[PDB]
Design a protein around this ligand. Sequence first.
Ligand SMILES: *[NH2+]CCCC[C@H](N)C(=O)O
Ligand SMILES: N[C@@H](CCCC[NH3+])C(=O)O
Lengths: 680, 681
Amino acid sequence: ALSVHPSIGVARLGNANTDNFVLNPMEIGGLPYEHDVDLKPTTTVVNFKDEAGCIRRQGQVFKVFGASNEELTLDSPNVKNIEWTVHLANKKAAWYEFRELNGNLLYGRDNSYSARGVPWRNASKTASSERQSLIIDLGPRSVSGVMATVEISINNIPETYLHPSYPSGELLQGSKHFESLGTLRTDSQGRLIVLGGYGFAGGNTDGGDDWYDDISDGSVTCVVTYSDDSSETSTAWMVVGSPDFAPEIVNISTLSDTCFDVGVRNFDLVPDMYDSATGHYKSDYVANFDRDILPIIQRISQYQWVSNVQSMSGFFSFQFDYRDGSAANKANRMKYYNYFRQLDNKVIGDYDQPQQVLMSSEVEGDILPLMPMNSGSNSVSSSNFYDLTDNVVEKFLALDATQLFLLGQWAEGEFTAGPADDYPVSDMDTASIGNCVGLPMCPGIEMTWSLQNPVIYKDAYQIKHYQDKAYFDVNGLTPERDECEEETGCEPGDLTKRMACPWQADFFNCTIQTVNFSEPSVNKASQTETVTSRTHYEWGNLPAGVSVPDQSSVSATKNVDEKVPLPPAYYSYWWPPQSPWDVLTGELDTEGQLHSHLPAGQQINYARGINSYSQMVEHWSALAFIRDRNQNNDGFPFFTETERNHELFDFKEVLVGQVTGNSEDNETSLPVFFINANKE
Amino acid sequence: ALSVHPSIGVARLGNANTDNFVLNPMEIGGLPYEHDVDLKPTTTVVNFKDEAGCIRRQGQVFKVFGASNEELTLDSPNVKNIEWTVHLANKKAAWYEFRELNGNLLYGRDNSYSARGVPWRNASKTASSERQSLIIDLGPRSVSGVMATVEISINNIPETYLHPSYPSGELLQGSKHFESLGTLRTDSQGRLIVLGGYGFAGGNTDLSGGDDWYDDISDGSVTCVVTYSDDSSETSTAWMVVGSPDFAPEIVNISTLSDTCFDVGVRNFDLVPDMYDSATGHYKSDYVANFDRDILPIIQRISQYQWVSNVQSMSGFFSFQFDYRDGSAANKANRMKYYNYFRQLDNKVIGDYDQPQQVLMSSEVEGDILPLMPMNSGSNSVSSSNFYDLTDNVVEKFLALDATQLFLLGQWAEGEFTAGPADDYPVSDMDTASIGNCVGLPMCPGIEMTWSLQNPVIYKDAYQIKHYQDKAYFDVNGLTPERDECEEETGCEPGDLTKRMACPWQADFFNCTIQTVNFSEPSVNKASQTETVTSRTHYEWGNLPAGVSVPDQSSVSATKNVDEKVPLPPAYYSYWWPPQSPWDVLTGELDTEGQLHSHLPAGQQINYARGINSYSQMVEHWSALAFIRDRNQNNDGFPFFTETERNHELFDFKEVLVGQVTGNSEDNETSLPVFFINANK
Ligand SMILES: *[NH2+]CCCC[C@H](N)C(=O)O
Ligand SMILES: N[C@@H](CCCC[NH3+])C(=O)O
């Protein structure tokens, strides 16, 4: 039988010229690739943006392999053609509003979208045909041969695709005109390259209904026709994400770790590690330091370039020897392990659980944030939101169950030093989704927690397809269908539909969360602040014999905020590798320093100047790519901002006395970055 | 035959207790009246507001007189009963959007609402029954007898009134629940008192938009039926109008609505045959005016504006720099120079822009520059000729007197006038006293009423509104939402005199301030203005060691600001209605407590609306504003008007040092006061 890799492709949006793109990373944490005129990868990316400051699309190369794992191309003996059919769709406008973990069936049927009352997006549209038309679906496109190109355009929808849909005409805010979901190409030997959207994000309100973006996902079909006209067919999936603004920095739990974990616990991917008959990991499984543990430590060690998480420093200091498996070092390994949060169970209404605990202790001397130190998958809504009393809460991050099992085996001394055998997972499969966020997912960046649900897969790393080209040709896509509920596979648009519509809202808010740590069932509460003030006046320096009566009055103010983080609260990151927050300035020449208004080497806010959600929707592409300036020298990283469109931004230095009224404060100033709409 | 006075009553909104009211002024520029328990007027008003800072309603007393001009009351010998029926309504939500002079048929049929394509308010409602239901109409109420009271309430609509309408349920913004248009009472002798609304303004859309908004302004018909001992009866009619508060009742408008009715009367109903020839349509140049009756009030009114606006260029028109009562030849050149500084009236012809009311100054030659008179906005200083998809939108930039006032001023100038008492005009004092306290000009749209009042077709005679149909017709049909009384010419319905005004009226009040008026292009009031600033930044570094140099750096940046409709320069700062919506007024608190709360010393001129920083705040907090009043009223001829009764406690205050704005701490020797409303109080 044939196989296509990667099993889940990953492309990234870009607004540069349609013909100006990079190719996929070839490993987790790898840079994307420049290419030659044959569309073969050459060197790692030189610049992420074009000269005009537009972000280049990143495309995914897919390859097809025969029974003995040899690659099939148009040059293979006995191959006369290879035809790729890709069907991408965006179902976001047709899906439910995002309400954290509501709708996630891993918590049981009582957490279904219907049982939780989650409203549909664009809720005034209630007939099925009206819901279907909210989907962006241009039908499938096909590509085959040497150096082919075809757009997934509203202008070349096949005649056989009876139900296309898209936001038509001139949109009233953001991007005006939707045109394309991306481009399919082949290289010089017939391999597929899928390129995604252009960063379109527009709608007809200011508010939020009737909005769209050009994120998409869907099916990949490959038909290889042999010289005698027989054929074989094999499938994969494809996902488009917004730009990876720090591609060398890897998420502690990636989506590859997610697929792997789902695989181990549900598809017998690693029989030695987990006993599928009983539903437990095997305590005799021996982990491997370099394969299983080291990546966690390395990933933790790079968050400092995009966030302030210094409390994690002890987990990569090598204050003791992480490679020493002896009894003498066991107390040390166990102490390291015991600082990681165990996983919550997935039971509705159970709040007092390890992911609601912030610190090791609150006794002075014994205070450390537990690990990894980041938000969990619901630090936003309390138990009592949305007219529920048992809304699922998950305040703080944990590793996935498989990572954590393997870490425990390390802690126990059940691990080796030296080479391990690879798991039965292709490296091409890990290289795509290993660059996507795995946790937390609220909703996340590329994908959300449907990817944790084994019912969407036909085997580890492989998305199950619902139906086929001939079905969708006649019927179109099914707007209300939940692949997690039906269990019979995914439709185009299913992997990305749950994310924010438009994505730049995920991006604007993927920063930090201020998370309560005193009441397990509470994230936010109403806060009433009453300030009662008595003003008393007296007059003096009066002549002898003169007096004037004092005067006094009382005033009060009452401020009510319906939903604010309950104190005491902890400053917690969301997705530092995918949405940086605290970064170093990198302009080393006078011109870049004048334009950026900053010296090099200073830590500042990554998004400075993008002061509103509407600005992010329009100017996302102006932001920097965080990159290792010392990449040639392994082990001595120096990550700074590169390629920020500094000219977009204006700048004012406000003296502190401007705010306070005290001119002595003007010895200190506050830098303010912003975007003036009136600039040319 | 009976007659009812006033012909057109005027009441004013108030949010104090329903039982806490003052009665109508008795003369033009008169204070309203306190009253006794019989509801008879006593002495002029003490406080305009109650102790809680809520404005007291002003009610209108109506009286009915017999064929001898003798007043009839329940105490009159041959009188068995007097029964009053008042039908007030608010048609504002069912009328057209206000678009300055569009719809005004005095400019010809080509200026009709339909020819001009003016849209309806709440334009999504198009069936006649749905338009009708936008009207606030609770039917008529009747009152008779000694000390009666009946509310114009949603809870006492007569069963015979088949189509009442009003905004039901809870409104989403501003006032939540509509309940009443006002109160009818009788006094101890059976006279009518009409009190109007309570200041309700609410709607279902956000004004920060403005569809499905309502206020409790109203107007409508008054019917009096007098029944005699023998059970015979006679009937007579009047009209009634409710306006927002008069915040400076002692200060009179240069042209009042009494002047409007008078002018309309002279020109169209033969009210004064010796002044105007109705067969040829011209004034009579041999009419001899009277200084005290005709001229002096203009001069006096001009002289009061200084208490509420900065109009110092008008000072020469009341200085007595020469003798205004000298009608001799030797003084004619002076009287003529005075008259010639007044704007003549524009002709109401579409497309004719180069006319006297587009002219600001006597000239722009140094030494010969004076703003023409009266110096104020006209009835369209807002929209240009090319607005609203039109090419010949009617413009009228600057104020003129009315045609009658100006005729009489010219008779003065020519020396055709008397000193001494005059013949009164055949107009009751009781008719001038009501509407003489309303704005007559300009009307864009105005305050109480707008330019329909200038149209003779709504009148059956001078000062008398013509009634369309009758009580039975409205019992069955309700009111006619689309009907223009000015187009049909067969009379007014309840709601017709106020429906054109802003909905809610607090928009008219928020904007009745000043206008920056272009005076270079007669067809233009506003234009788009594009300001492009192109900036080259250049850097050089110096004081470097010997042999060291670094290159200069430079770059270029630009901003392009586009405002779509702003006054076209050069422009002139022009008032709207200083008497009715004050702008520059004197602070009035003479004791320490009032000064601490106000944050100001007494005697300082400051902005009247300070702290009301948005339209939405005006809609909520109109009633906090001051009444401008003569603190020296006991001493005739020595006025001293200041704010009184401002609800200072509503407002917060910040003193901003100028260096907070500029970045230069040396500028901190100077500060700017900023008043505002913190909703979290
Ligand atoms: N995946 C990130 C969502 C951010 C949530 C936001 N700060 C909130 O409190 O609503
Ligand atoms: N200032 C307003 C009009 C004033 C309305 C007064 N009667 C404008 O430019 O629209």
